[PDB]
């Protein structure tokens, strides 16, 4: 078979995307039960962003100042409040399509699926990784704010991201579903910049294991390396250090291929020093680090 | 903003995935109205594949020999037939979730979204391109047969692919939604092999235009080239020739960037001859050819 960075089926989530208009500002909201979540900067305007005070700005609003639409239909907001960077709007209608869900704060290195919306209307789904610097390399045009990232385990939607801002770098930033920012970032149009983006080492190995499982194994070697000697190389190449813990995770994949994680590290070390020299791995002129061990295992067995 | 190869929201299609069991063989079926479509090899068994005769094999079956389930529920098949490589099973229940749809035969170079299923249950969505050799580089494990590829224009699902086989290469093959194979391929476990896989030239330019729109423009140059001189290079590098027609398509993108398609070709020619020399385009150590002009435009404006 093969390996493609896939996203979870977006159906369950499409049924929760609504639209939230406030003054001259429109974006996307997440409708679960009778609460509609969304970025709090929906109450701001252009020069508001220069330096918003959300306490002042919000005190000057009422339920009636938020127009929300589910499809063409109108929902009536009957309460508002602020949670960190999110607005929580109570509404009369509970959502019939509300799925078994929960809010989780994802960790850096971990991946999730993004459902890009515009005006409460889903545009497309793609998968991505929460970088070590806390940015996602996504695709978000204007109006995409309030779009959510998630994962589906069984029948249960774990929401983990809502979009807010685009950084000067052209890379993105947002919050968990409690309005807490991933990263140092704030919701102001100011000077903030992304930290340095290190390669997710553990993810690059998972993907190598994926390649081996798919016959692409030209990169292997007889050598091995101690955990230390490896990190000493990794760090030169802007790679995340490797812990005996990351190594443990890579267990089942080592067992499935009879390749020792420390042998695989040696493989990686050679690729890092000698370069990839034209050849391709799973069809890439470069090492993929947005696929996690869990991702690879659910896609690579018999 | 950015650029990510996205897939269409899979919701409308998830509501059509059912399961089709026949003897010791289970796979996925596409339920629209009261017809359930699926690969005809559902009636085969192991050594049947060595050299099936679907006329014989099917004559020995009846409606009662096909168990189909929508979720946990059971549908009752009340008619069967064969269309090229597809089985069409009439059933009592029309599908409540049936969307505005249609069947289209996609052209090579064009892209579509795949919804990977197993046992009538959607596993994940990803986008991919129909290669010039008529294979898709997908991710399909055993049980994924009958999974569909599609595109959504407005509110209308255009189905264009159903999965059947995995080639020795580890690359895949299937049919349009009339059971006609894309490519020379047949549904027999035999020696068939994929032709040579040329790079979708038009798609590689669209993506360069995408990169320019995203500030990644280090690859441009003052030079230009005649359509001819370009193809003469392209062909050396296993690239699809370029027609004045492909060029016309690239119009709006040339107009949006003030970069002439023939100038962009010159850019590409240098990349093809001089190599990419370490640097990355839109974050790739290699040229992406599974994003079409249409794909790029819907994701790259203001």
Swiss-Prot record, chains A, B:
It is found in: Host cytoplasm; Host Golgi apparatus. The active site is at 41 (for 3cl-pro activity), 145 (for 3cl-pro activity). Residues 1-302 are cytoplasmic. Residues 1-302 form the Peptidase C30 domain. It catalyses: TSAVLQ-|-SGFRK-NH2 and SGVTFQ-|-GKFKK the two peptides corresponding to the two self-cleavage sites of the SARS 3C-like proteinase are the two most reactive peptide substrates. The enzyme exhibits a strong preference for substrates containing Gln at P1 position and Leu at P2 position. Exists as monomer and homodimer. Only the homodimer shows catalytic activity. Cleaves the C-terminus of replicase polyprotein at 11 sites. Recognizes substrates containing the core sequence [ILMVF]-Q-|-[SGACN]. Also able to bind an ADP-ribose-1''-phosphate (ADRP). May cleave host ATP6V1G1 thereby modifying host vacuoles intracellular pH. This is 3C-like proteinase nsp5. It comes from Severe acute respiratory syndrome coronavirus. The chain holds residues 3241 to 3542 of 4382 of the full protein.
